[PDB]
Design a protein around this ligand. Structure first.
Ligand SMILES: CN[C@@H]1CCCN(c2ccccc2)C1=O
Ligand SMILES: CN[C@@H]1CCCN(c2ccccc2)C1=O
Lengths: 264, 265
């Protein structure tokens, strides 16, 4: 991959692998989420980051995901080249927003797009902090100053408020534990595993006769390696679902979200 | 990737990704196992397979793994290019053997190597059958006739007999279920998931202070999407050895058995 001419965004092409596809021989939504994560990581590395920043390391501050929104029009087939352009932008003292555009490398058409909201927090105390001026000036030089939104639309499905699933749930997948393959290089369960866990409560029949068009996920709390998760789903309708990840014990909420599916 | 000049092997380079590395910032053994699987799938596609032949699809036959043996000297770091050369060979009427060599793309040194044994089976009845001559002649043209072994050694750890773990196990990981990300394009549990499940019973302290050097895994039965697995381990030893066992949580039906060897960092 590489930064674009202006150095205000990054592009990368990926060839879809055999183990990255589902029953329909097209990349899964977890494969796409992994590639978004990878292109965002490469973009940070290309401009001198290594989480990010030098003064942030001194204060033990990290960037965490608060919301992920992914909309797919066409899933790349096994063997296809998909090009992803990503960029970051400042949302004032609230935090940052990272956007993505997925394209077919042969036709150049947009086959999907994603958006994410990140908040600043203390690695140790887990306390959210409002973005400071000295930290803002460090990354602003790598962001476009004019707004560049993957989801520009007036009142789009990416900024909607997600409600809490009421008990009893219609569908459920209980006793979900992460294995070592679910952890990142810092031994934390990465954001993509939560997506897979959310979709575990979706009934197999829906998966077999529908394609996932949209997924909006809110991150409330991190799941420890020794925590057990319950995935809950309810049809709220194309098919719509309301989701909830919570700890198997106390029932402490770790995630909430919505998915939208279209008939094949 | 591409077939080599003679068309009797296939090569492919891979760049190691951020989500593919562990705490050491080097590729995990499941990432390597995924790349071996990928280069073997690309080799079959490059010579006209999908790795079933015309005679096989007609009789509802499939190739299944009976054993996987992986030996790593150096795990590629995040951002490194690793080159993998793979080839297949005939082991008479028993079945086929697929081999791999992993190299550093910068230095050209061998950083690892793998071997696998495959048996022929009816997809529906799950019954093994010996390779027939009409099926053998279909893939023999894509294999070297002279032996080409990644593990040539006289008394190599790849052909050793694996014993069954005796109860009680020293270590265990109970209640392991595969999720949809664990399934392949045909809704079957990926062979790589069994490797991850085997290593779940290895204690975290061993993982933190050791590097996995060898893993030999025997496949006895496939795990259904709605089956629950128990992973069992016992130390059998400078270097640490383990005996492993995957079995169904209910009846205790054996699905996998194996051994791992670790060395101090
Ligand atoms: C996780 N979000 C971070 C926060 C701010 C810095 N940053 C970034 C900006 C431009 C290029 C590379 C990286 C991000 O994406
Ligand atoms: C399990 N091994 C399979 C079946 C036998 C033939 N075969 C292959 C040989 C040469 C090129 C491409 C594929 C395989 O990989």
């Amino acid at each position: 991959g590489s930064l674009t001419e202006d150095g205000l965004s990054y592009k990368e092409k990926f060839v879809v692998r055999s183990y990255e596809v589902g029953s329909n021989k097209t990349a899964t939504v977890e494969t796409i989420a992994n590639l978004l994560q990878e292109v965002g990581c490469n973009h940070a590395q290309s401009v001198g980051f290594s989480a990010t920043t030098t003064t942030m390391r001194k204060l033990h501050l990290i960037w965490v995901t608060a919301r992920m929104h992914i909309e797919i029009y066409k899933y790349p087939a096994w063997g296809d080249v998909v090009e992803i352009e990503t960029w970051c932008q400042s949302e004032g003292r609230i935090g940052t927003r990272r956007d993505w555009i997925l394209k077919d490398s042969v036709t150049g058409e947009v086959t999907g797009r994603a958006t994410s909201k990140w908040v600043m927090m203390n690695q140790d105390t887990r306390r959210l902090q409002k973005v400071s001026d000295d930290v803002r000036d460090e990354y602003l030089v790598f962001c476009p100053q004019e707004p560049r939104l993957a989801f520009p639309e007036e009142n789009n499905r990416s900024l909607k408020k997600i409600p809490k699933l009421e008990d009893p749930a219609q569908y459920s997948m209980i006793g979900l534990k992460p294995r070592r393959a679910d952890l990142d290089m810092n031994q934390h369960v990465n954001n993509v595993t939560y997506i897979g866990w959310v979709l575990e409560s979706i009934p197999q029949e829906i998966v077999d006769t529908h394609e996932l068009q949209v997924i909006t996920l809110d991150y409330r709390r991190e799941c420890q390696q020794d925590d057990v998760v319950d995935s809950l789903t309810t049809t709220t309708s194309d098919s719509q679902f309301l989701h909830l990840l919570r700890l198997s014990g106390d029932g402490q909420e770790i995630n909430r979200g919505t998915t939208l599916w279209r008939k094949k």
